[PDB]
């Protein structure tokens, strides 16, 4: 029983690590998507001006 | 109870004929916001060239003198991407892409031959803790001049402008998607946050607790939210695609009006159109709300919500054939479709539509090439 | 002994469930990170074109 | 704002014992190995035990009356007393810092009882008002409810923020909206449920006499009804009690 409990504790630690990594990745994705949408808008605008 | 949805300029542009009175062209890259503060008789526009130009509401007529900006300011840097006049106060606010938010006192109280601008406050945000600013709304609740602003990382904050301290700080989940727009109740009792994945969260500003409101079926990108002047629990969302500007209730969370204006089958989701809408001005007026949407097709539409078949367009090209606006129920929603049978209109994507009035209400617009045109 | 054995069994089952969940979460995280990398590359290309 | 003073209100203070909601910790195998009596203890039985919650009013660290038990009630899956205890003390006889100890008990063996908890909640809270409504006290484990002042087993300490705001809502001090609060209240219910679930300690629910013979709208408030001459003399004209004592005696 003690061994099982210790294994659960380590699993929880790794879960916390994964959660922190997820948070960082989500911030990065937010920034990227912001840039992507802005770029698409500017692309369409420049194309219209060219035509 | 005493506060009103009516903005600075009441609606006297009941019916814009499409006439033009000014062609202010001073910006260089892209105008992306317009504000009007009739308390001081001024209005402002920012852009990506790093400038925030202030004009005059009485010189727009240009009937006698030439039309040019009264002031300028290009010291914030970056790419000024929003601004808001501070109600009941003689200063403005701006937020650059550097991640900087600053006030700018406008010397309107004095009226010398030299209009003046003078920075007052400033607040710089990190690039990994908070991120840049995506929105800004001001309301003078109680005796604290609250200036609520959002951030990319998803932490809506309120920066009191009297004691210079945080009033509240709501946190938003970024597992849904980035924030794109939000609106605040007319009496500061709830707010709606739209995302870039269709989610439209909601919040309870009295308890700072979260309340959900709805999603989107096509999981498209929301571009603009607003508060309806009649339904207390209504937010007018403008989803990308099919030139759509739908309306979603929150107590129940379902669609109740779709301003369909595209070729796709009403309420279709088979990716059929690239057009969208960004820019709106709703006004309840005399119990017959008028709604003007200028979008990415270089048109300025005028929807008469009282009678959908009496709506019309007030800008475009000379080769556009006349159209007809329908009114057909579709699975429990009024879907007002639109079907078709020297040009002064804008030649590129329009990014805003305001309406300031001094004697006869005018309409202001700005395209993605810097042009500005004050219709009548 | 019998009561302790029952408790042990319950704990073992819970641990197994949690371990499988952790493995799935890790795989999803790796996939998402790879997608982000590729997306940023494509964004750079689009910038050049613009 | 209407209220009745504690001095005038002459009835018996009543308290409802609700449900002890929580999880009860057990010992290891060696404990039962050394002391076999634990096997026949109440806690080591599969079904919920027939606990009974005593109650005694304290003041200044001094007991004020005898304790009151709970009438026997069988339990099958939960601890749900739902009983209206009657306390020996009355409202006009409660001092300002009166505090009600409440101890839970369980069988340990033939002719012995063992405390399974203990909680102590003040009666007259802040601003000198009798606590009403349905308060969920905390439960300190394996310690008899302590009555000393200050208590070593206190009952009640973003959950705190919502606790204050909810009160201001029903006292009229809040913005008025129907749907928004209809949903937010369920939100607070879920938040409180989660907070209770996370906490390791137990939590004994309890209710006061919010509804009585009089209108419920009233509230109880602590109350009671108490240069010719320069050098003070505070007993100038009174009875000489020592003189009377001597006169009566012989």
UniProtKB/Swiss-Prot annotation, chain A:
Spans traversing the lipid bilayer: none
Localisation: Mitochondrion; Nucleus; Cytoplasm
Source organism superkingdom: Eukaryota
Protein's name according to its UniProt entry: Beclin-1-C 35 kDa
From-to range in the entire protein, with total length: 205 to 255 of 450
Curated annotation (Swiss-Prot), chain C:
Top-level lineage group: Eukaryota
Coiled-coil region(s): 1-50
Compartments where found: Late endosome; Lysosome; Cytoplasmic vesicle, Autophagosome; Early endosome
Tissue expression remark: Highly expressed in brain, lung, kidney and liver.
Function: Versatile protein that is involved in regulation of different cellular pathways implicated in membrane trafficking. Involved in regulation of the COPI-dependent retrograde transport from Golgi and the endoplasmic reticulum by associating with the NRZ complex; the function is dependent on its binding to phosphatidylinositol 3-phosphate (PtdIns(3)P). During autophagy acts as a regulatory subunit of the alternative PI3K complex II (PI3KC3-C2) that mediates formation of phosphatidylinositol 3-phosphate and is believed to be involved in maturation of autophagosomes and endocytosis. Involved in maintaining chromosomal stability. Promotes DNA double-strand break (DSB) repair by association with DNA-dependent protein kinase complex DNA-PK and activating it in non-homologous end joining (NHEJ). Required for centrosome stability and proper chromosome segregation.
Subunit relationships: Component of the PI3K (PI3KC3/PI3K-III/class III phosphatidylinositol 3-kinase) complex II (PI3KC3-C2) in which the core composed of the catalytic subunit PIK3C3, the regulatory subunit PIK3R4 and BECN1 is associated with UVRAG; in the complex interacts directly with BECN1. PI3KC3-C2 can associate with further regulatory subunits such as RUBCN and probably SH3GLB1/Bif-1. Interacts with SH3GLB1; UVRAG bridges the interaction to BECN1 indicative for an association with the PI3K complex PI3KC3-C2. Interacts with RINT1.
Designated name of the protein: UV radiation resistance-associated gene protein
Organism of this sequence: Homo sapiens
Classification of source organism: Eukaryota, Metazoa, Chordata, Craniata, Vertebrata
Residue span relative to the full protein: 251 to 300 of 699
From Swiss-Prot, chain D:
Keywords for this protein: ATP-binding, Autophagy, Cell cycle, Cell division, Cytoplasmic vesicle, Endosome, Kinase, Lipid metabolism, Manganese, Nucleotide-binding, Phosphoprotein, Transferase, Ubl conjugation
Signal peptide from the UniProt entry: none
Subcellular location: Midbody; Late endosome; Cytoplasmic vesicle, Autophagosome
Domain of life: Eukaryota
Transmembrane segments: none
Residues found modified as Phosphothreonine: 157
Post-translational modification: Ubiquitinated via 'Lys-29'- and 'Lys-48'-linked ubiquitination by UBE3C, promoting its degradation. Deubiquitination by ZRANB1/TRABID promotes its stabilization, leading to autophagosome maturation.
Gene Ontology MF terms: 1-phosphatidylinositol-3-kinase activity; ATP binding; phosphatidylinositol kinase activity; protein kinase activity
Region (Disordered): 143-157
Gene Ontology biological process terms in this record: autophagosome assembly; autophagosome maturation; autophagy; cell division; cellular response to glucose starvation; early endosome to late endosome transport; endocytosis; endosome organization
Domain C2 PI3K-type: 29-171
Role, per record: Catalytic subunit of the PI3K complex that mediates formation of phosphatidylinositol 3-phosphate; different complex forms are believed to play a role in multiple membrane trafficking pathways: PI3KC3-C1 is involved in initiation of autophagosomes and PI3KC3-C2 in maturation of autophagosomes and endocytosis. As part of PI3KC3-C1, promotes endoplasmic reticulum membrane curvature formation prior to vesicle budding. Involved in regulation of degradative endocytic trafficking and required for the abscission step in cytokinesis, probably in the context of PI3KC3-C2. (Microbial infection) Kinase activity is required for SARS coronavirus-2/SARS-CoV-2 replication.
Family to which the UniProt record says this protein belongs: Belongs to the PI3/PI4-kinase family.
Protein name according to UniProt: Phosphatidylinositol 3-kinase catalytic subunit type 3
Lineage: Eukaryota, Metazoa, Chordata, Craniata, Vertebrata
């Amino acid at each position: 029983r003690k061994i099982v409990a210790e294994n659960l504790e380590k699993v929880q630690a790794e879960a916390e690590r994964l959660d922190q990594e997820e948070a960082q990745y989500q911030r990065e994705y937010s920034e990227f998507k912001r840039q992507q949408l802005e770029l698409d808008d500017e692309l369409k605008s420049v194309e219209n001006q060219m035509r | 109870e005493n506060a009103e949805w009516e903005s600075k300029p009441p609606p006297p542009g009941w019916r814009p004929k499409g006439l033009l009175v000014a062609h202010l062209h001073e910006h260089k890259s892209a105008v992306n916001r317009i504000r009007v503060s009739d308390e001081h008789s001024l209005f402002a526009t920012c852009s990506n060239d790093g400038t925030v130009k202030i004009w005059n509401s009485q010189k727009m007529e240009g009937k006698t003198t030439t039309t040019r900006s009264i002031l300028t300011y290009s010291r914030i840097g970056g790419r000024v991407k929003t601004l808001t006049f501070c109600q009941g106060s003689h200063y403005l606010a701006i937020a650059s892409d550097n991640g900087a938010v600053q006030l700018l006192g406008i010397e309107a109280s004095k009226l010398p031959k030299s209009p003046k601008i003078h920075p007052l406050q400033s607040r710089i945000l990190d690039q990994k803790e908070d991120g840049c600013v995506v929105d800004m709304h001001h309301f003078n609740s109680g005796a604290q001049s609250v200036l609520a602003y959002a951030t990319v990382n998803g932490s809506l904050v309120g920066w009191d402008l009297r004691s210079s301290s945080n009033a509240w700080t709501l946190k938003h989940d970024l597992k849904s998607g980035l924030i794109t727009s939000f609106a605040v109740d007319i009496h500061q009792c709830w707010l709606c946050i739209g995302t870039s994945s269709g989610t439209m969260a909601c919040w309870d500003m009295r308890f700072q607790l979260p309340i959900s409101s709805h999603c989107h079926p096509s999981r498209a990108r929301i571009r603009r939210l607003s508060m309806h002047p009649l339904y207390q629990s209504w937010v007018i969302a403008a989803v990308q695609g099919n030139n759509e500007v739908s309306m979603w209730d929150m107590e129940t969370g379902d669609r109740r009006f779709t301003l369909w204006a595209s070729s796709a089958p009403p309420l279709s989701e088979l990716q059929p159109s690239p057009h969208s809408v960004h820019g709106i001005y709703c006004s309840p007026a005399d119990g017959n709300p008028i709604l003007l949407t200028a979008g990415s097709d270089m048109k300025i539409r005028f929807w008469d919500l009282a009678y959908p078949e009496r709506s019309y367009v007030v800008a475009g090209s000379t080769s556009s054939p006349s159209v007809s606006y329908y009114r057909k129920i579709i699975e429990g929603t009024e879907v007002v479709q639109e079907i078709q049978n020297l040009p002064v209109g804008h030649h590129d994507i329009i990014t805003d539509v305001a309406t300031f009035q001094t004697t006869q209400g005018f309409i202001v617009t700005a395209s993605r090439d810097g042009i500005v045109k004050v219709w009548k | 002994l019998e009561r302790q054995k029952k408790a042990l069994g319950r704990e073992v089952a819970l641990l197994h469930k949690q371990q499988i969940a952790l493995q799935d979460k890790g795989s999803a995280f790796s996939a998402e990170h790879l997608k982000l990398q590729l997306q940023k590359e494509s964004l750079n290309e689009l910038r050049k074109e613009c | 704002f209407h209220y009745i003073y504690s001095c005038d209100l002459d009835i018996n203070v009543q308290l409802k014992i609700g449900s002890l909601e929580g999880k009860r910790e057990q010992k290891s195998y060696k404990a039962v190995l050394e002391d076999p009596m634990l096997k026949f203890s109440g806690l080591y039985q599969e079904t919920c035990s027939d606990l009974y919650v005593t109650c005694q009013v304290f003041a200044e660290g001094k007991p004020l009356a005898l304790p009151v038990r709970t009438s026997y009630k069988a339990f099958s899956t939960r601890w749900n007393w739902n009983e209206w205890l009657k306390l020996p003390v009355k409202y006009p006889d409660l001092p300002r810092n009166a505090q009600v100890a409440l101890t839970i008990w369980d069988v340990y063996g033939p002719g012995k009882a063992v405390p399974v908890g203990g909680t102590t909640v003040s009666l007259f809270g802040k601003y000198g008002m009798f606590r009403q409504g349905m308060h969920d006290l905390k439960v300190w484990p394996n310690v008899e409810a302590d009555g000393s002042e200050p208590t070593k087993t206190p009952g009640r300490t973003q959950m705190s923020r919502l606790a204050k705001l909810t009160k201001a809502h029903r006292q009229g001090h809040m913005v008025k909206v129907d749907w928004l609060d209809r949903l937010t209240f369920r939100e607070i219910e879920m938040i409180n449920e989660s907070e209770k679930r996370s906490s390791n300690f137990m939590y004994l629910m309890v209710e006061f006499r919010c509804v009585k013979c009089d209108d419920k709208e009233y509230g109880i408030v602590y109350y009671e009804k108490d240069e010719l001459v320069k050098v003070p003399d505070p007993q100038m004209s009174m009875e000489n009690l020592v003189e009377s004592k001597h006169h009566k005696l012989a």
